[PDB]
Structures are given as structure tokens and as C-alpha cells.
Amino acid sequence: IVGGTASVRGEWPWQVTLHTTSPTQRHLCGGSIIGNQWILTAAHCFYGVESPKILRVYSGILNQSEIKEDTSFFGVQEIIIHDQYKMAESGYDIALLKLETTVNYTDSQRPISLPSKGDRNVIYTDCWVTGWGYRKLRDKIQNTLQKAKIPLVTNEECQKRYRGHKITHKMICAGYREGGKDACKGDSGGPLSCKHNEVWHLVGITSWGEGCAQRERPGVYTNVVEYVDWILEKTQ
Numbered sequence: 001i002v003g004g005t006a007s008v009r010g011e012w013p014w015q016v017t018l019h020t021t022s023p024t025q026r027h028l029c030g031g032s033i034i035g036n037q038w039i040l041t042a043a044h045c046f047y048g049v050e051s052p053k054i055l056r057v058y059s060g061i062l063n064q065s066e067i068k069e070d071t072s073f074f075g076v077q078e079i080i081i082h083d084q085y086k087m088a089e090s091g092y093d094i095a096l097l098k099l100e101t102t103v104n105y106t107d108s109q110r111p112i113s114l115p116s117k118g119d120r121n122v123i124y125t126d127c128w129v130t131g132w133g134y135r136k137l138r139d140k141i142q143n144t145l146q147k148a149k150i151p152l153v154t155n156e157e158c159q160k161r162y163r164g165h166k167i168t169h170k171m172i173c174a175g176y177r178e179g180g181k182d183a184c185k186g187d188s189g190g191p192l193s194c195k196h197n198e199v200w201h202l203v204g205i206t207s208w209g210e211g212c213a214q215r216e217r218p219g220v221y222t223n224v225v226e227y228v229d230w231i232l233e234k235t236q
């Protein structure tokens with residue numbers, strides 16, 4: 001996260017860090033708890049992944065350094081990638097992880113509600129992007145979970161900034177016109193969480209952008225509301 005600030009323990013209890021264990025254990029992507037056995041994340045996270053056997057899902061994490069041998073985690077049974085997915089820049093950047101066991105909801109690990117299909121056209125004004133991603137393009141994964149409040153940009157304006165792309169209504173953009181606050185490398189798959197009528201909704205999934213936090217180049221997120229039927233069908 002560029003231009004963000006440190007989160008506090010328990011501030012984003014749906015946030016997970018998805019780790020790969022081969023050849024060594026490392027953070028790969030962010031993700032969101034959406035159900036007792038389900039993580040919502042980006043399809044592009046699995047580009048170098050042939051099987052879910054190398055994945056570990058960690059909930060309740062503040063610092064990456066707090067993850068030790070005895071820290072509990074969840075195994076992944078199945079990776080469900082949207083069948084129309086090809087590359088982040090072309091959309092359908094969404095994946096479900098079915099956990100090997102169910103999550104016991106606590107203060108440290110809770111689900112985030114999906115947006116309501118009736119709220120399809122709401123332009124949310126209290127949106128936050130979170131993750132352990134880079135603070136600038138040439139950096140490293142942050143130890144402490146970062147957060148940044150970012151405004152949503154309309155599809156029409158976002159399409160004007162990304163003229164060499166097709167920005168569909170299945171994408172949602174967020175960023176300041178002057179730049180300065182954005183997701184960056186290591187944040188993908190994580191949530192764009194918006195508080196609407198005192199309820200947090202998973203409005204976006206961190207997907208891609210032209211550089212990080214550049215002026216007139218907002219971050220591009222998978223527009224979760226457009227995938228509610230797909231999520232309900234895949235999770236039964």
C-alpha cells in the first residue's frame with residue numbers, strides 16, 4: 001500500500017495473507033474471508049500455482065514476522081478460478097479458495113459481507129484498501145498490515161485514464177486524481193472494503209494498475225457485486 005498507515009490488530013478481521021510454502025514460505029497475495037470455508041481472492045495469484053497443496057491461509061495477522069511454526073493456519077482443498085479469466089488487465093480476476101476445514105469466527109477472524117445486488121449502482125464514499133504490499137514500486141513486502149482510504153472513480157473517468165484497455169462494469173477503479181495513495185505489489189487479491197450504512201461490504205478485489213499511486217492512474221479492482229451470482233453458485 002502506497003501512502004497508507006499501519007492497521008491495528010483486529011481492525012480488518014476478514015483480511016488474510018495467502019502464503020506459498022515451496023521452495024520456502026512467503027506471502028503471495030491478500031484475500032478476504034467471505035464464509036466459514038471460503039476465501040475470495042484474485043485469479044492472477046495462481047499464475048505460478050499448479051496445486052493448492054503449497055498454499056497456507058493465515059487469518060488474524062498484523063505482522064508477517066509474527067508467523068511462526070506454531071501459528072495456526074488453514075489448508076486449501078480447492079482453487080476455483082473464473083472460467084473466463086485470462087489476465088488481470090482483461091477482467092474476470094476472481095478466485096475462490098475452499099478451505100480444508102471451517103473457520104471459527106472470533107474477534108480476529110470474521111467474514112465480510114458481499115455487496116447487495118440492489119446496491120449495484122451505489123458510489124461508496126468510505127472505501128479502504130489493505131495489505132502487506134510495497135510502499136513504492138521498488139520495495140519489499142511490508143511487515144505490518146497497511147491501510148489507505150481511497151475514493152472510487154466512475155467507470156467513464158477510469159476508461160479515459162486507461163484508453164489502451166477495456167474498463168468494463170465488471171471492474172471498479174479507485175484513486176486520487178493527484179495520485180499518492182494506492183495498492184501496490186503484494187496487495188493483490190486483498191479487499192477494497194467499503195462501509196455503507198455502518199456495514200462493511202467487499203466492494204472490490206485488488207487487481208492491477210499502471211504503476212502505483214501515479215497521478216490520473218487509479219487502481220483497478222474486480223467489481224465484486226457483478227460476481228455475486230457466480231460466488232453463490234460456486235459456494236452452493
Ligand SMILES: Nc1n[nH]c2cc(-c3c[nH]c([C@H](Cc4ccccc4)NC(=O)/C=C/c4cc(Cl)ccc4-n4cnnn4)n3)ccc12
Nearest residue numbers: 026027028045183184185186187188207208209211219220
Ligand atoms: N513475497 C513477496 N516478495 N515480493 C513480492 C511481490 C509480490 C507481487 C508482485 N506483483 C504482485 C501482484 C501480481 C501478481 C503476479 C503473479 C503472482 C501473484 C501476483 N500485483 C499486486 O500485488 C498489485 C498490483 C497493483 C494493483 C493496483 Cl489496484 C494498483 C497498482 C498495482 N501495481 C502496478 N504495478 N505494481 N503494482 N504481487 C507478491 C509477493 C511478494
Ligand SMILES: *[C@@H]1O[C@H](CO)[C@@H](O)[C@H](O)[C@H]1NC(C)=O
Nearest residue numbers: 009062063064065066143144
Ligand atoms: C510489528 O513489527 C514491527 C517492525 O516491523 C515492530 O516494531 C512491532 O513491535 C511489531 N508489532 C507487534 C504487535 O508485534
